Structures are given as C-alpha cells and as structure tokens.
Nucleic acid binder design. Sequence first.
RNA 1: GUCUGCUUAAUUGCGAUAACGAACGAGACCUUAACCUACUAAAUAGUGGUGCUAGCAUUUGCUGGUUAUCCACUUCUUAG
RNA 2: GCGCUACACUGACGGAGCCAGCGAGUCUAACCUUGGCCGAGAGGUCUUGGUAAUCUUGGAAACUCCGUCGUGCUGGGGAU
Lengths: 140, 104, 63, 142, 61, 315, 206
Amino acid sequence: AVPSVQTFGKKKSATAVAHVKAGKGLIKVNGSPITLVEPEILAFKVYEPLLLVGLDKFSNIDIRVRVTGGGHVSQVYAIRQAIAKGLVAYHQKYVDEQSKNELKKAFTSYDATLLIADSRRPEPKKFGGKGARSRFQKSY
Amino acid sequence: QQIIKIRITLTSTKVKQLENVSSNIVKNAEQHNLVKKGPVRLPTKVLKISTRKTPNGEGSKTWETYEMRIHKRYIDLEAPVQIVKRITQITIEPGVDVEVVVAS
Amino acid sequence: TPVTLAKVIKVLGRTGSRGGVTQVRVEFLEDTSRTIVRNVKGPVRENDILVLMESEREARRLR
Amino acid sequence: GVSVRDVAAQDFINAYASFLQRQGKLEVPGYVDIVKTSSGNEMPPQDAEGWFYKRAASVARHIYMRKQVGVGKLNKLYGGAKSRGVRPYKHIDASGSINRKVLQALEKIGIVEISPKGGRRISENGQRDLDRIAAQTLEEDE
Amino acid sequence: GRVRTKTVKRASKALIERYYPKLTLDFQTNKRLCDEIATIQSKRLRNKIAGYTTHLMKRIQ
Amino acid sequence: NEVLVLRGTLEGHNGWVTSLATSAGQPNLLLSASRDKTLISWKLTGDDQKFGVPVRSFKGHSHIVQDCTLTADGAYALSASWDKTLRLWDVATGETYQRFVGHKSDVMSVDIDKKASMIISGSRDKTIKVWTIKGQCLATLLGHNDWVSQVRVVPNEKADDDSVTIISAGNDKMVKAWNLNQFQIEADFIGHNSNINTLTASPDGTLIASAGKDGEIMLWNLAAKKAMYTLSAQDEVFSLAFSPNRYWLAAATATGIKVFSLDPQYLVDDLRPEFAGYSKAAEPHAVSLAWSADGQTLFAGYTDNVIRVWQVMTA
Amino acid sequence: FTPVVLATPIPEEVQQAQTEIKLFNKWSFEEVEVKDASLVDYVQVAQPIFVAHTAGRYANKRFRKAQCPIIERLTNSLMMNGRNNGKKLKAVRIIKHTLDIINVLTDQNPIQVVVDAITNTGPREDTTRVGGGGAARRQAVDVSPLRRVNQAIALLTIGAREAAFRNIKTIAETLAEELINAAKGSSTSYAIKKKDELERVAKSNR
RNA sequence: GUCUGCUUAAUUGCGAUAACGAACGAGACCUUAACCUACUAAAUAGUGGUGCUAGCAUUUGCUGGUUAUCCACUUCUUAG
RNA sequence: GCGCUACACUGACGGAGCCAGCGAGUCUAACCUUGGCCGAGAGGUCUUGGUAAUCUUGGAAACUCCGUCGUGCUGGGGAU
C-alpha cells in the first residue's frame, strides 16, 4: 500500500534508518526507544526535534530507527537529523509541501546540523610528530 | 545439455584494460542471452610500503607510500560444458587474472 | 567613581611592536559631538561601546 | 503489552539479580567468593556475593541482546584495560570459568541454551522468564 | 588568496575580444560555452577562467 | 482605459525561476518551474493574504530545469533539465507512468500536441527527438549547426486534416517548421541578428511570434508561411505570451512588459515596478510568463525567488 | 492541558513542562536579561539550550566567539588541570550542577546570577606589554569589550579550581561559592582579590 | 632570459621587457577519507514476508528464539 | 635530556547502566583460545572451533546512572 516513506542518517562516522510507516504511536532506537536514552546526560539531544512542532504529528508517524559505526556521542546527531530529514521526507513524499515550509522555518532556527550534517574532517597525520599539527622536539 | 552456474574473479592495476574486459564480459555473454549478474565491484585492496628515503641515520627524520591499488573486481554466468569454455577461452590480454571457480 | 561610557567610531591603524594594540577615534555616548583619540587592547571593531572611568588622556601614539 | 529494551539496563540487573538471589536451584560454584574474577583488576568484586546474583541478569538480557558467543567472547567484555602503572596503560581478556559455569547452570532450569553453530541463544521458557520479569521491573518504573 | 593568474587572465582576455557576442554574466552559461570555443587542460582550470571572464561583462556595461 | 493594477504575489524555490505553465485543462492546477532540482505546485484559491496554497514539491534532476508542459488534459507535468532528460510528473503526486535518457548536451525543450502523444524536445548535440507519451523515437531530426533555444504547439478551428504541423529555433539564426506524423519539410524564418532565445504560438492554427541578443522582435502566418507587424525592443527577452482568445503581446524585456499590442501597433503599459537595494546590471531580470489559461493572469514569473502574478482591471 | 496519547509513553512530565513553552526545562532564559551597557552584544541572554551542545564552528569566523552560548563559553576554560583535557561530558553532567547549588544558595533566578558574574567580573582599565625597552610602562589602555569577557571567564576558573584541591568541596560548592561571592562582587572570591590586583596596577603607568 | 611591480603554498601566474620559445623541480600524477535510495552480486553482509516459535497483551497487538522453514530482496554492510 | 601517575567533591572509591576503530592467528605443531566446570584471586584445565567478513570477536576506557565519602595531606597521593 505500505504508506513506507523513508531515509538515512549521517556526524564524523556512522548512520540511522527512518521505515517511517503507518501504525500506532512508536520510536525504536537500537532496539530500545529513544524514554530509554543511552548516554543519559546528553539525553536531551534527541528530545528536541516530538513536542520542536506537535509527540499530534508523531502519533501517525512510526519510526523503527536502526542504530549502527563511530565512544558514544557520535551518532547523536547522525539519530537527530534522522527524525526531522524524515519530518520532511514524511512531509515531502506524503504530507504536502508547505508543511515543508510552514518547517525547515521551524528546524531552521537552531540553524544547526538537525537538518544539514557536519562538514569538518579529521586532518591526515605526519611524518614527524604526534593529535595533528605537531612537530617533533627541538636541539642545539 | 548439462548446466553449471560459473562465477567469473578478476584483478589488475589499471581501471583501463580492466573495465574493458566487464563490457566486452557482460556483452560477450548477453550476445549469448547469460541465466548472470552485473560486474560486482569488490572493496578497494591497498599496500603502503612507510620507507626512509635516505641511504644512510643521516639527515632529517624524510619519509616516503608507494602502493598497488587494485580494482578487486566479479561476475556470474549458466551454460553447459560447451558454451562456457566456446567465453572463460575468450576474454582474450595484458594486466589481468581470470579464475573459473566452477559450480557443478 | 564616575564612569563615562564612550562609543568607538573610527578604528584607525595597527600599533605596538606585537600588534597587541589597536589605534582608536571616540564618540561620547553618555555628549555626542566631542570626538576626542585613545588606545585599547583587543581583537576591535567599530561599535565597541567602550569603557572609560578616566574621562581624557587626551592619548598619543608606542614599539 | 510489554517488553528486554522497553525497560532499563539495571532494574530488570537488580530486580533478576533478588529473583536467581532468591531462587535456590540457583547452583553456586566453589571459587565464587574468593580468587579474583579479572588479572588487571587487585580487587575482586566488592560484593563477594550472590556478582556470581548480579552477573545472572547481565550474560543471562545480554543474550536472547543478540543471536549467539560463549567463552573467549564474555571474555573480551568483562574486564577493561590494565593498571600497568609506570609502561603506558593497556585490553585484558577475565577467566572463562564462572560464565564457562552460569554457562552450565542457567543449561539447568531453562533460561540460557546452546546455539547450534555452538555456544550461548536463551531457550523458547527462558526468554517466558525475561519478557514474566521485564513486566513485574517495568512496574517499579511505572 | 582569493589571486588570479596569467595562464588564467591573458586565456579570458584573449577570449573576451572575439566573443563579446551566442556573450554573459547564470556565469553558469559561459562555463558550458567556454568549451565549445576553448581547447582547455582541465575541470578546475576551466571554472577559474569564466569566474574571471564574469568579473568582465559584470563591470563592462 | 485599462489601468494595469499591480497586486499580491506568491513568493517559496531557492534557485532561479527558469518556465511556467496555463493549465492546459484545469486553469487554477498553477503549476510552476525551477532551477534548484523541483516544481512548486501553487493553487489560486483568489483569496487574499498569499494571493492564492504552495500542495505538491515534485524533487530531482541531479541539475537545472529549463522547462514543465501540461498535457492536453492538464494533470500530468513533463520535465526536462541539464542532466539530459524526461521525468513525467503527476500534478495531483511526488511521481515519476514513465525516466524518458539519450541526449548528450542539457535539454533547452518540451511540448505536447492536441491529443497528448508524439512529444518533442530540443538540445545543445544540436538536434530534436520524439519521445511518445516511452523513451522511444519515431525519429531523431537533424537539419540544424545549433543551440535549436526552444519548438511549440499548432493548436488547431482548419479543424485538422490529420497529417498535422508543429515547429523550432538558435545560433544559426533561423526557425524550421517537421508533419509532427512523418517529419516532412516546411518553411523557415531567414534574416535575424543573433539568438532566437524563444518563440510562441497561437491560442485555431494561424498565429505565432520569433524574438531576440539583438533587440528586434521579428513576428505570424503558418496557415498566408510569410514573414510579418518587425518591431524594435532595444536588451532581450529570455519569456513570449499570447492574451488567449485579447490581441495583446507580452514579452520580459531586462529593462518593460511591452504590451506589444499586435493589433494596430502601440504601447498601451510597461511593468517595471516592485523595486529595493540594487546595482542595475539587480534587475532580478526574467524568466517565464503566461496568460489564466481563462485569459486575464498576467502568471508573471521572475528570477530572485519571487513569481509575481498583476491582472488587468477597470478604469 | 492535552496528554500526547501515542506502547511508548514518552513523558507527561517532560512532554506539562516543555510542549506548555522554549529553554532547558529546569531553569526558565523568559524574563532574564543583562543590566549593563558595553558586554550587551558580546554575551549571547540565550538561544535555547530545549541542553547546556553546539558541533561548534566558533573560530574560523574572527568574531562569532561573540553567537556562542556564555553557558556552553564556560563548560568552555573548565576545559582542563591537562588531565581531563577533552572531557566536556564531565564538564556538563558540573555546570548542570552549578546552576542548582547558585538556585539553592540566595534563592534567585540562577541563570541570571550566572549572567551577573559577567557584568562586575570584567577587567576594564587594563595594561599592555609597549616593546618599551628593557623596562617601560603597561601603556595603560580599556581592553574592545570583546577581549573583556574573554578574561571574565578565563579569571574565574583559576581560583575555584584550587578550592577541589586537597579539598572536601566537590566546583559543582566552590565555583557556587565564587559566583554568588563574585557578582556582591565581594573578594571572598578571586576576581574582584585579580580583576581589581590590574584596575589597580594601571591607575598609576597611567 | 631569472625582471620594477602586483600575485600566490610556490621562478605560482599576468603584466613591465633585445630578449623568443622550451627542459627538469612545483604542480600535474599515485594513496587513503568523504558522496552516489542509479547500476553489479552475495547461508563467510542484512531485510521484510514466513512458518516453527518462547513471553507480556489479549485489540488485530507488543516482546522475542530460528547458518535454511522457506523464499524474496540488496537501503543498508561490503566492493568493483 | 625523553616520560609516566597526582596535588581533589569539575574527585576517589563502589554497584548499575554499559559503548568503536586500526589488527592478528595455529602446519607440519601449539597461534587464538571461547564454551562448561575447578580457583577470593592470580589462574588451572578439560575440551572446543578457527589457516579466518567463517572461531576467540558484537560487550575497551573516559560516561550516564544511583550513591557513599564532606573539606579532615583525607575517603587526594600509592612511595617504599
């Protein structure tokens, strides 16, 4: 039928898979819903996006988010991107088009990642010296 | 008429002879129309031998990273003892290795 | 302790040996048209409200 | 309707720990108070107790979470690095012994089982005994 | 910097002579065109010729 | 008399509006074009705020849209772009019936005859190619030596024989009118002073316009094939527009809209309003225009990212 | 006021708390402002962190240091003492503490007394090393206000650090023992006993 | 020729020039990290559907176990 | 000269959450070892797989958890 549409997630390493289908309520992350966050101080990172908008919208919209890659805080934006990402992949393929413009002017405001993943790279290393722009000791 | 499901496994150092062979491959076999897949294309291994430059401690500490980058490349192909042999004989070449890990 | 809050207008030219000093006009915010030319220490712009309890030393250009 | 997942990672720990403390069946092997688990811990477990009944809900939630594994797997997991001291800090693989024996004691009732390919798979009971006790640890949260 | 080069200028300054008329500033319509005309090495080089040109027709007018 | 008054717009796209389309069977069902790889579907509700509800994006190419022709029925929107296609969209929905592929250089067009069938499309490979309502060619015409710029449909009240006629475009500085069934040969437009970047057509079978990089708008007949009213409009039009049944021209001359009035020969009414923070060479100069299918609503389109539709009303 | 009824009860405590409302839903950033003219413009009161982490591209552009949320140029400092160096999640599991030991001790709007430990803690009349010779004077010149606040955080971190240092007091009880007495500043703190100690090395040289 | 000047990571380039046009270096090139919901295949990667199935709900649901129960897939994960 | 831990409550101790990536590996013989037992522990071993995306190998630490310690050179320090 199924009505499913659907996405990925990407911040410095890994992915998620928002299978955003038609069911009754749910938001399964890693085989463990989001009340059950994981590194439980950052916990509020993912909690912004359910409320950044109506916990109203996500009753309809069912996300089994599987989470691989990327130490714990890497993926935190990867699963944030992906609930918004698709927030507009539901609100693009399915829920209209100004519902992607009412949004992205909400979701564009923290004007952050959320939507557009980070750019920055780790710099390659060299010869001689150890994290990156380091040069070995000096002599005389 | 005994059918056999062969699997074709390639490797070289040039992306230009090599790509050449799954164009020739999968169109010297769709001529034959065979039941096959499309040139699967396997993670690029990719060896970096660090070495110093100088012939003698002296002299700054002044190093190299020469390497062979293969493009590993495989295929598929059914067909009896007759029309996998006429195919393995033909692509025939410089740079390249063909195995026929047969599936009788 | 009388504080005279003076607004920077014209950032002028770089100074000091080590470039620790910009020069600086300033427009007195709180007596507009006075337009004295002190110095400061910072990585400045035009509009850095600037803070002086020393009304006034007017300063001269330091190696 | 009511999950092992739907519930936290130390209430299920302490509320299967006071289930497998108060079961009696569980057996309790003879180098399981003294002996240092892990050899970089100086300190064995600060419980000396029914870590064995706190390693009996870990192991067990840990299986089911995945397919299969153990003893040279719960060997890379339970330890951490090393205290080498002076020598830049170093991983150390436990002692297959205690959980090579809860894995042959869980084998007993019908909680953990031996996954074909082999080694520890929870049975078919077992799971029955973790979805009964993830819904009795969901109501100390509820 | 951002400081332009000969090979480049002297390739737009030769060009700008003939082709002022096809000539434009949407530079993404020169880019295409600037191949049909020059016989360029590269993709990067080529994107730095027309960059300059558009710095001619944006000031010529 | 007709004081043409300048009204509420419909703003929405991030790139640069490059066609726009007269709906051609449900004139609401606006349906607009792009640059940044979609097609924002705008209703005309109409009801004032938004003049009238941006309800289906449609996303992409990989690259920039130069067109978006509606069908004879008017709920099936036909793409183009700079990555060598088509991708037939459903106005209603988000979908790709039939990727039509095959070109080499960058489609410049798209159009559909009076029954919705034997489609066409220009190119830079310097052709043309028919692709029926399947990725399939009748044939691949080659009479031109150039960038053939644009091709149009014409909407026939000699009631159609059945061996019909279409058209074309333009650095060789000529047109050429290709039987849409077996691409025969019919007349061309000799003369002009550089790029033919457009043309248009009659709303019965006996009117046309081409146009300018020189200045002049060189006019038609097709059912006289004789060269006509030769105007003089300085910069260029990029962006031509018949009213459908008035005799008003509309084309966006840089600078006007020059309504020229193709009966008598006059300047009725130039719209260069509205305008805020520019250095000329910033106007945010158009790139598509249209006349409500039923013929008022001028859907005036501009660079920027703000469509600015501007209807004619009362003295 | 409307509990969502989604299986997954994602809170009705952190749903009425942050639906009715934005901002970190312990402290409300909601009728809390700044009282000086100079350190407005160069100390974000708050864009909403609903926690106390932004990637953080704050030093490329020569200014945005500005745009940087105060709370997260703070956790930023602490970042040290060298051994922690790197640890932000120890530095927010510590200042997410600090804001409860200001609310609890005063009874204040503590995210404001966080801000009043800024403008008060800033050195204005400051010196510079004129070169100058073998010996010269530190021509006395008032920092921009840019620099000022760079110091107003920098100062505070090098004296509430020795206070845990062979100390019964876990920086959560010395940080809030510095900001309450550093805004009332007092001199039981370390800024208003160096800030003043730089005014006071300048007022001469000048 | 190999230069007053402006130019760059750079004898890197416009330009000034009894100096015209080339070689090496640098750069071009090779390694790897990113991207491809288009291709090519995967019981030494994983999906749903499928049973077999072990619990909570009983509301169809929710939580599983299964190197074959079968297949179908190839976003994923590998890699040409 | 090159370096490790620490002068703390922004930490030390502890349960309870509990997370990667670069490798490697036994053949003519003892390289990786689980699992399931024996040991407070360090380990012992039966036995197991693995010439390896096929085994040990999906469970590493900074941390969130829930607190005891309360300004006591300690409950920082870990020398001898």
